[PDB]
Amino acid sequence: KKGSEQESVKEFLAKAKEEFLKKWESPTAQLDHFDRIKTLGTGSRVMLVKHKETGNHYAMKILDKQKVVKLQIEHTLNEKRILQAVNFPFLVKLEFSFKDNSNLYMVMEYVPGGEMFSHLRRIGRFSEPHARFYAAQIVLTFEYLHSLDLIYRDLKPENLLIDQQGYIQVTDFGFAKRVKGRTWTLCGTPEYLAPEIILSKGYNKAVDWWALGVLIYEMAAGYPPFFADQPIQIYEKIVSGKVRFPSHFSSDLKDLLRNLLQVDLTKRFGNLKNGVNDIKNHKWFATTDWIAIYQRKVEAPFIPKFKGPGDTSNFDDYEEE
């Protein structure tokens, strides 16, 4: 039975790689086709827009060529090329992309449930079954991406949107990269960086598994495991090899997290002979029906409220520029 399940994963990934490669090797609209509505998020912006012809709403990522000045540029090409070639239930869909004299634009499906980040900070923490439901989707998404030699490199609740079924949509592929062995760019978000990134070591997809450990801890605790006011203090905590857990964490959860938040790459789950199955077959996931999650048959822990098309009530406000 587990043998049948493993053969079926092999089959699915072989077909997924064939489809990805067709689009990867052979990868529009214009700005006046959309009414800009509201900024949904911003960083070093994404706007809700409304397509004038069809009335459909989208999330438009706008990249200022005057800001993307850092050697930033490769990462932007990675993002567009990867998003146009992947296809998975928990990855945001890219619809259009175009550019003008000032900006690059990627137009994606609008996911109106808001960021996991908002919901988590509002309620404080998620119970373990609630956290597990989200974590299972990330596990499957990384099994898919890594099989295509893609590393994601920016997992955190800010980048996980909740859709109308209560499932996750992974957004922001700005640091995602196709990597056949190791890569060397120092990039990511401080609380979620693996030790080998901070230590300026060439690294591989195991940094995404470390970051899953940070995410599961933060979802279940309400704060991440390496927590300080300044990035340099965070980095010292990450490289030490020490993690402490809330007293309400189950022992199964602590065991899984000790194996993800493992500084020694010869021991870190996701990075061993059995690959992702050390994670999928861990006791903390014993209740998880992996195929039922993929097929979206599992009832979600909560469904965000929506008042209609173009509703932005589940997002925070930002200064409009």
């Binding site: 960083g43 800010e158 990511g188």
Partner: peptide, 12 residues
């Protein structure tokens, strides 16, 4: 620790 949204870092 930092409780608001966290910015990614693109180089060192």
């Amino acid at each position: 620790g930092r409780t608001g949204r966290r910015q990614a870092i693109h180089d060192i």
